[PDB]
Short mmCIF file of C-alpha atoms and ligand atoms in Angstrom, two decimals:
data_model
loop_
_atom_site.label_atom_id
_atom_site.label_comp_id
_atom_site.label_asym_id
_atom_site.label_seq_id
_atom_site.Cartn_x
_atom_site.Cartn_y
_atom_site.Cartn_z
CA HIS A 1 -27.35 6.67 6.38
CA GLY A 2 -24.86 8.37 4.10
CA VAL A 3 -22.34 6.66 1.84
CA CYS A 4 -21.97 2.91 2.43
CA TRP A 5 -18.92 0.82 1.48
CA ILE A 6 -19.15 -2.96 1.11
CA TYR A 7 -15.71 -4.54 0.82
CA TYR A 8 -15.10 -8.08 -0.44
CA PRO A 9 -12.35 -10.26 1.08
CA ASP A 10 -10.60 -9.96 -2.31
CA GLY A 11 -10.18 -6.19 -1.88
CA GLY A 12 -12.82 -4.97 -4.33
CA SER A 13 -15.79 -2.97 -3.03
CA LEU A 14 -19.22 -1.46 -3.75
CA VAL A 15 -19.78 2.15 -2.70
CA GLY A 16 -22.78 4.47 -2.77
CA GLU A 17 -25.87 5.65 -0.92
CA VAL A 18 -28.43 2.92 -0.19
CA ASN A 19 -32.25 3.01 -0.48
CA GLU A 20 -34.79 2.73 2.37
CA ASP A 21 -34.41 -1.06 2.27
CA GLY A 22 -30.64 -0.69 2.64
CA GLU A 23 -29.98 -1.75 -0.94
CA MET A 24 -27.19 -0.55 -3.25
CA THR A 25 -29.65 0.90 -5.78
CA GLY A 26 -29.22 4.08 -7.84
CA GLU A 27 -27.43 5.90 -10.67
CA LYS A 28 -24.40 6.94 -8.65
CA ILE A 29 -23.22 3.54 -7.37
CA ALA A 30 -19.70 2.21 -8.07
CA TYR A 31 -17.68 -0.96 -8.02
CA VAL A 32 -14.06 -0.20 -7.12
CA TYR A 33 -11.34 -2.69 -8.07
CA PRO A 34 -8.70 -3.85 -5.53
CA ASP A 35 -6.31 -1.05 -6.58
CA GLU A 36 -8.80 1.30 -4.85
CA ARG A 37 -8.57 3.55 -7.93
CA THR A 38 -10.10 1.82 -10.96
CA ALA A 39 -13.90 1.96 -10.88
CA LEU A 40 -17.11 1.14 -12.76
CA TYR A 41 -19.52 3.97 -11.96
CA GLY A 42 -23.19 4.35 -12.76
CA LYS A 43 -26.39 2.38 -12.48
CA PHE A 44 -26.72 -0.49 -9.97
CA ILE A 45 -29.76 -2.35 -8.63
CA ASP A 46 -29.27 -4.00 -5.21
CA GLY A 47 -25.52 -4.12 -5.75
CA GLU A 48 -25.83 -5.56 -9.26
CA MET A 49 -24.17 -3.58 -12.07
CA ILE A 50 -26.67 -2.49 -14.74
CA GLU A 51 -24.53 0.18 -16.36
CA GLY A 52 -21.01 0.79 -15.04
CA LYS A 53 -18.87 3.35 -16.87
CA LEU A 54 -15.09 3.24 -16.51
CA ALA A 55 -14.01 5.79 -13.90
CA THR A 56 -11.21 6.72 -11.51
CA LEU A 57 -11.62 7.19 -7.75
CA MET A 58 -9.86 10.56 -7.45
CA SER A 59 -10.36 11.12 -3.73
CA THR A 60 -12.46 10.27 -0.72
CA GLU A 61 -13.59 12.76 1.90
CA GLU A 62 -15.10 11.44 5.14
CA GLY A 63 -16.09 8.28 3.28
CA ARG A 64 -17.56 10.22 0.34
CA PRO A 65 -15.91 9.16 -2.94
CA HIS A 66 -15.17 11.51 -5.80
CA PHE A 67 -15.34 9.79 -9.18
CA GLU A 68 -14.12 11.16 -12.49
CA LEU A 69 -15.23 9.29 -15.62
CA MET A 70 -12.55 7.97 -17.98
CA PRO A 71 -12.64 9.12 -21.61
CA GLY A 72 -14.57 6.96 -24.07
CA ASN A 73 -17.66 4.77 -24.10
CA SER A 74 -16.38 1.81 -22.08
CA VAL A 75 -19.49 0.54 -20.28
CA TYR A 76 -19.92 -2.75 -18.40
CA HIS A 77 -22.84 -4.71 -16.92
CA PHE A 78 -23.32 -7.75 -14.69
CA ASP A 79 -23.00 -10.46 -17.36
CA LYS A 80 -22.54 -13.74 -15.50
CA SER A 81 -21.68 -16.73 -17.71
CA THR A 82 -23.92 -19.79 -18.21
CA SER A 83 -22.98 -23.36 -19.11
CA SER A 84 -22.75 -22.36 -22.81
CA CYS A 85 -22.48 -18.55 -22.87
CA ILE A 86 -19.08 -17.27 -21.72
CA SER A 87 -19.92 -13.56 -22.20
CA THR A 88 -22.27 -11.14 -23.99
CA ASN A 89 -19.15 -9.38 -25.28
CA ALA A 90 -16.20 -11.77 -25.68
CA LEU A 91 -13.89 -9.09 -27.14
CA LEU A 92 -14.49 -6.41 -24.49
CA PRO A 93 -11.42 -6.58 -22.18
CA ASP A 94 -11.45 -6.00 -18.44
CA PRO A 95 -9.93 -2.52 -17.89
CA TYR A 96 -8.22 -3.39 -14.58
CA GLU A 97 -6.66 -6.50 -16.11
CA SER A 98 -5.65 -4.63 -19.31
CA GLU A 99 -3.39 -2.36 -17.31
CA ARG A 100 -1.69 -5.25 -15.54
CA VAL A 101 -1.13 -8.24 -17.82
CA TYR A 102 -0.61 -9.17 -21.46
CA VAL A 103 -0.45 -12.42 -23.41
CA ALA A 104 2.76 -13.44 -25.23
CA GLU A 105 4.65 -16.62 -26.14
CA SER A 106 5.53 -18.39 -22.88
CA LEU A 107 9.16 -18.66 -21.76
CA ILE A 108 8.44 -22.30 -20.88
CA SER A 109 9.46 -24.37 -23.92
CA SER A 110 6.62 -25.96 -25.90
CA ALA A 111 4.05 -24.43 -23.54
CA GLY A 112 2.31 -22.09 -26.00
CA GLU A 113 1.13 -18.68 -24.85
CA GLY A 114 1.73 -17.38 -21.35
CA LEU A 115 0.53 -14.50 -19.17
CA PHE A 116 2.97 -11.67 -18.39
CA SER A 117 2.85 -8.70 -16.00
CA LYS A 118 2.94 -5.14 -17.43
CA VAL A 119 4.02 -3.73 -14.10
CA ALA A 120 6.23 -4.20 -11.05
CA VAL A 121 3.89 -4.94 -8.13
CA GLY A 122 4.06 -6.21 -4.57
CA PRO A 123 2.85 -9.44 -2.89
CA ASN A 124 -0.87 -10.32 -2.89
CA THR A 125 -1.74 -8.23 -5.95
CA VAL A 126 -4.74 -9.26 -8.06
CA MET A 127 -3.47 -9.30 -11.65
CA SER A 128 -5.94 -11.14 -13.86
CA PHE A 129 -9.40 -12.76 -13.88
CA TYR A 130 -10.34 -16.33 -14.65
CA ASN A 131 -13.86 -16.16 -16.07
CA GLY A 132 -15.41 -18.92 -18.16
CA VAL A 133 -18.53 -21.00 -18.71
CA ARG A 134 -19.99 -22.75 -15.66
CA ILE A 135 -20.35 -26.53 -15.79
CA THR A 136 -20.67 -29.28 -13.16
CA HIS A 137 -17.85 -31.43 -11.78
CA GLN A 138 -19.65 -34.47 -13.18
CA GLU A 139 -19.64 -33.03 -16.71
CA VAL A 140 -15.91 -32.31 -16.38
CA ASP A 141 -14.79 -35.48 -14.58
CA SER A 142 -16.89 -37.57 -17.00
CA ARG A 143 -15.41 -36.51 -20.35
CA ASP A 144 -12.26 -36.70 -22.50
CA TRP A 145 -9.17 -35.36 -20.65
CA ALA A 146 -8.34 -33.38 -23.80
CA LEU A 147 -11.43 -31.20 -23.18
CA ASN A 148 -10.03 -30.11 -19.81
CA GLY A 149 -6.97 -28.00 -20.61
CA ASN A 150 -8.83 -24.91 -19.34
CA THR A 151 -11.02 -26.27 -16.51
CA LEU A 152 -10.70 -24.68 -13.05
CA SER A 153 -12.83 -25.73 -10.08
CA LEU A 154 -14.73 -22.75 -8.64
CA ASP A 155 -16.46 -24.34 -5.66
CA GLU A 156 -18.30 -27.48 -4.60
CA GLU A 157 -21.02 -26.94 -7.22
CA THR A 158 -19.18 -25.36 -10.15
CA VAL A 159 -16.24 -25.72 -12.56
CA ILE A 160 -15.11 -22.79 -14.77
CA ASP A 161 -13.98 -23.57 -18.36
CA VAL A 162 -12.68 -21.65 -21.40
CA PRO A 163 -13.48 -24.13 -24.19
CA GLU A 164 -12.61 -23.87 -27.89
CA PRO A 165 -12.58 -21.41 -29.60
CA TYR A 166 -12.52 -19.10 -26.57
CA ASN A 167 -9.02 -20.32 -25.65
CA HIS A 168 -7.84 -18.05 -28.47
CA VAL A 169 -7.29 -14.38 -27.68
CA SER A 170 -8.72 -13.49 -31.09
CA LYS A 171 -12.10 -14.94 -29.98
CA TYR A 172 -12.07 -14.19 -26.27
CA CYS A 173 -10.18 -11.54 -24.29
CA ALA A 174 -12.77 -10.44 -21.69
CA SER A 175 -10.53 -12.16 -19.08
CA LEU A 176 -7.06 -13.71 -19.45
CA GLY A 177 -6.45 -15.86 -16.35
CA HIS A 178 -6.62 -19.04 -18.42
CA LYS A 179 -3.36 -18.01 -20.14
CA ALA A 180 -1.23 -18.43 -17.01
CA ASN A 181 1.02 -21.48 -17.39
CA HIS A 182 2.06 -23.96 -14.66
CA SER A 183 5.17 -23.93 -12.41
CA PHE A 184 6.35 -25.72 -9.26
CA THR A 185 7.93 -22.43 -8.24
CA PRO A 186 4.94 -20.23 -9.09
CA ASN A 187 4.81 -16.50 -8.43
CA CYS A 188 0.96 -16.48 -8.29
CA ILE A 189 -2.00 -18.49 -6.96
CA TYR A 190 -5.61 -18.78 -8.05
CA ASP A 191 -7.84 -16.99 -5.53
CA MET A 192 -11.59 -16.36 -5.04
CA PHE A 193 -12.93 -13.13 -6.58
CA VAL A 194 -16.35 -11.42 -6.69
CA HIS A 195 -16.43 -9.55 -10.04
CA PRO A 196 -19.09 -6.93 -10.87
CA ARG A 197 -19.20 -8.13 -14.50
CA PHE A 198 -18.39 -11.84 -14.25
CA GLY A 199 -19.85 -12.58 -10.81
CA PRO A 200 -18.17 -15.12 -8.51
CA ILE A 201 -15.01 -16.37 -10.25
CA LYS A 202 -11.32 -16.93 -9.55
CA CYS A 203 -8.45 -14.50 -10.09
CA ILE A 204 -4.67 -14.68 -10.40
CA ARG A 205 -3.02 -13.16 -7.32
CA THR A 206 0.76 -12.69 -6.88
CA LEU A 207 2.44 -14.55 -4.02
CA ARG A 208 5.21 -11.99 -3.93
CA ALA A 209 6.87 -9.08 -5.71
CA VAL A 210 6.85 -9.47 -9.50
CA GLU A 211 8.66 -7.31 -12.05
CA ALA A 212 7.36 -5.71 -15.24
CA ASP A 213 7.39 -8.31 -18.07
CA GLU A 214 7.82 -11.21 -15.64
CA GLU A 215 5.85 -14.32 -16.66
CA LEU A 216 2.98 -15.07 -14.25
CA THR A 217 2.67 -18.71 -13.20
CA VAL A 218 0.48 -20.76 -10.86
CA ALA A 219 0.84 -24.32 -9.53
CA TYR A 220 -1.91 -26.30 -11.29
CA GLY A 221 -1.97 -28.84 -8.46
CA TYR A 222 -2.96 -32.07 -10.18
CA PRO A 223 -1.41 -34.94 -18.37
CA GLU A 224 1.93 -35.68 -20.09
CA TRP A 225 3.80 -32.33 -20.16
CA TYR A 226 3.15 -32.02 -16.42
CA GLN A 227 4.53 -35.38 -15.28
CA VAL A 228 7.66 -34.69 -17.34
CA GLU A 229 8.18 -31.25 -15.80
CA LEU A 230 7.63 -32.91 -12.42
CA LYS A 231 10.60 -35.22 -13.09
CA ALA A 232 12.62 -32.21 -14.28
CA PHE A 233 11.90 -30.33 -11.04
CA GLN A 234 12.56 -33.04 -8.43
CA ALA A 235 16.11 -33.19 -9.79
C1 KH3 B 301 -6.17 -25.94 -11.45
C2 KH3 B 301 -5.55 -26.55 -12.69
C3 KH3 B 301 -5.26 -25.51 -13.76
C4 KH3 B 301 -6.53 -25.12 -14.50
C5 KH3 B 301 -6.30 -23.95 -15.45
C6 KH3 B 301 -5.41 -24.35 -16.62
N1 KH3 B 301 -5.46 -23.40 -17.75
C7 KH3 B 301 -4.35 -23.82 -18.61
C8 KH3 B 301 -4.30 -23.14 -19.97
N2 KH3 B 301 -3.01 -23.39 -20.61
C9 KH3 B 301 -2.18 -22.22 -20.35
C10 KH3 B 301 -2.28 -21.32 -21.57
C11 KH3 B 301 -1.67 -21.97 -22.81
N3 KH3 B 301 -0.22 -21.82 -22.77
C12 KH3 B 301 -2.22 -21.31 -24.05
O1 KH3 B 301 -1.42 -20.91 -24.92
O2 KH3 B 301 -3.46 -21.21 -24.16
C13 KH3 B 301 -2.40 -24.63 -20.08
C14 KH3 B 301 -1.82 -25.37 -21.27
O3 KH3 B 301 -0.60 -24.72 -21.62
C15 KH3 B 301 0.47 -25.66 -21.68
N4 KH3 B 301 1.27 -25.57 -20.43
C16 KH3 B 301 0.90 -25.00 -19.27
N5 KH3 B 301 1.89 -25.09 -18.35
C17 KH3 B 301 2.92 -25.73 -18.93
C18 KH3 B 301 4.27 -26.15 -18.51
N6 KH3 B 301 4.73 -25.90 -17.26
N7 KH3 B 301 5.03 -26.79 -19.43
C19 KH3 B 301 4.58 -27.05 -20.68
N8 KH3 B 301 3.37 -26.69 -21.12
C20 KH3 B 301 2.51 -26.03 -20.30
C21 KH3 B 301 -0.19 -27.01 -21.78
O4 KH3 B 301 -0.50 -27.24 -23.16
C22 KH3 B 301 -1.46 -26.82 -20.99
O5 KH3 B 301 -2.48 -27.72 -21.46
#
C-alpha cells in the first residue's frame, strides 16, 4: 500500500509505489543493483525500465528509499537482445560493472584478453554481466565450432552469444562477462541474473574473496587449448 520492494534471487531489486493493479508503474520507480547502492531511477511500466537514470540509494527509512541522481546524462532502458541485435547502444557500459571489472591482457599465456577485478570483494559478489544475442541450441549445436567461442547456454530454450565483431571491446562494451577466461581453479561461476536493461541473462559471481586486479576466471565446463590445459592441470 506504500513502497513495495521486489527482490530477485540474484540480489537485485525493484522498488517503488505500485498502481491500483499492483503494478510497478510510475516516474519514481527504481532498479537497485545487488550492491544495494547503485540504482537506475525514473520511469517504469509494470516493472519494465522505460527511462532509468543513474542514481545512488542514499538511505532507506521504514522501507522508503531516498535516491540521489548521479551527475551526467547516463540513462538506460529495457533493451533486451534479439537473435541479431545485441543492444541498441553497444558502447554504453553498465555502470555497476564499470566500477567492478576491467578488460586487460590475460595472465594465462596465449589466452588473449581477460577480465580483471577493480576491487577487493567478498564471496558471492556479482561482478560482471554476460549479455549477448539470443539464439537456439539447435543453431549453436548445428554450426562450425569456431563460431562458438562466446556461446553460453541461458536456459532450456536459449543460448547467449557475443559474435564477431562484438567480441571486441571497441565494438561492444555494454557488458563484459564474455571476457572471463577459463580455469580449473576458478574464482567465479556463471550465475542467473535478471537485468533491468538486458533482461534475463547470466552474470559472473565470485566463489570467494578476490583482490583488486585479480583475474576473474570461470570453469567453462565442456576445443584444443582446453584439452591441453586439462592435461597440464591433472599433473
Ligand atoms: C560455458 C562455456 C563458456 C562460454 C563462454 C566463453 N566465452 C569465452 C571468451 N573467451 C574469453 C575472452 C578472450 N580471452 C578474448 O580475448 O576475447 C574465451 C577464449 O579465450 C581463450 N581462452 C579462454 N580460456 C583460456 C585458457 N584457460 N587458456 C588459453 N586460452 C583461453 C580461448 O581463445 C577461448 O576461445
